[PDB]
């Protein structure tokens, strides 16, 4: 059935590889927040590099969202790319909000450039997200790793470039509206 309540978890790469494009990431997040202002649309901001942190715990309070955006605007990307840790912080909040009883969307902003065993960890954690009933989208930055993002997202139709033709914003907004009453 159609839904009105969505919880949107932004899982944002602040590793060194994306440092020169942090503005694109921030702008995407600000634009999607701007689009969805209802209190039944709750947002959470998570950042990750060599460790992950919840910048904005899940909330519909727009004052807190404004401050969360101020905090994201000052981020200084550096270090390694442990995307699995960012996904796990989204999963922990989803589990605490109700698990399969929730209406949960994860949007990962990343170049998908993963090292060593991180692909293994990331794919396992995204499979956990889906087991909790969440849907995973990936928005690719720079010369992003398309296949890696397709594996993390629910499918290739939930992967978009952050650059060009308003593809990512339109595609994700229209995907959410399709699920909406
Ligand atoms: Mg990186």
From Swiss-Prot:
Expressed in prostate, thymus, ovary, testis, pancreas, colon, heart, kidney, lung, liver, peripheral blood leukocytes, placenta, skeletal muscle, small intestine and spleen. Residues 7-176 form the VWFA domain. Residues 1-181 are extracellular. A divalent metal cation binds at residues 15, 17, 81. The modification Phosphothreonine is found at residue 110. It comes from the Eukaryota. Disulfide bonds join 2-181. It is linked to Hyaline fibromatosis syndrome: An autosomal recessive syndrome characterized by abnormal growth of hyalinized fibrous tissue usually affecting subcutaneous regions on the scalp, ears, neck, face, hands, and feet. The lesions appear as pearly papules or fleshy nodules. Additional features include gingival hypertrophy, progressive joint contractures resulting in severe limitation of mobility, osteopenia, and osteoporosis. Disease severity is variable. Some individuals manifest symptoms in infancy and have additional visceral or systemic involvement. Belongs to the ATR family. Binds laminin, and possibly also collagen type IV. Necessary for cellular interactions with laminin and the extracellular matrix. (Microbial infection) Receptor for the protective antigen (PA) of B.anthracis. Binding of PA leads to heptamerization of the receptor-PA complex. Upon binding of the PA of B.anthracis, the complex moves to glycosphingolipid-rich lipid rafts, where it is internalized via a clathrin-dependent pathway. In the endosomal membrane, at pH under 7, the complex then rearranges and forms a pore allowing the other components of anthrax toxin to escape to the cytoplasm. This is Anthrax toxin receptor 2. It comes from Homo sapiens (Human). The lineage of its organism: Eukaryota, Metazoa, Chordata, Craniata, Vertebrata. The chain holds residues 38 to 218 of 489 of the full protein.
